[PDB]
Write a structure and sequence with these properties.
homotetramer, mainly alpha, 38% helix, 0% strand, rod-shaped, de novo protein, foldamer, alpha/beta-peptide, tetrameric
Chain lengths: 32, 32, 32, 32
Amino acid sequence: RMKXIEDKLEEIXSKXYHXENELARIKKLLXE
Amino acid sequence: RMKXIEDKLEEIXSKXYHXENELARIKKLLXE
Amino acid sequence: RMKXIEDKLEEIXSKXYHXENELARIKKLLXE
Amino acid sequence: RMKXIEDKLEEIXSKXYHXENELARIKKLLXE
């Protein structure tokens, strides 16, 4: 149930870091 | 619980703006 | 509540089309 | 309800593989 959905949403937290970091992978291929 | 999941989904709202804006970062590296 | 979370997850459906289509924006900047 | 939300979140699992694989599409356009 409810708490163990909340603790899936706080995984989908991890995937929305890994969104950020692996876009910021691409920006720094495109970079400094 | 339920309402404070809904108010996580409306964070995952924020990450799916930041999807958009930081793709639209890349499109404008690739741009005008 | 429950049904109106389900009908947020089936928005986050829409954002995970717009993931796809606006990556496939970038692939076709990078293209045919 | 609850279990069939959990089994939507474990689809949004599939979309956050397809995030990964179709970014890693772009990295290997940009590549080896």
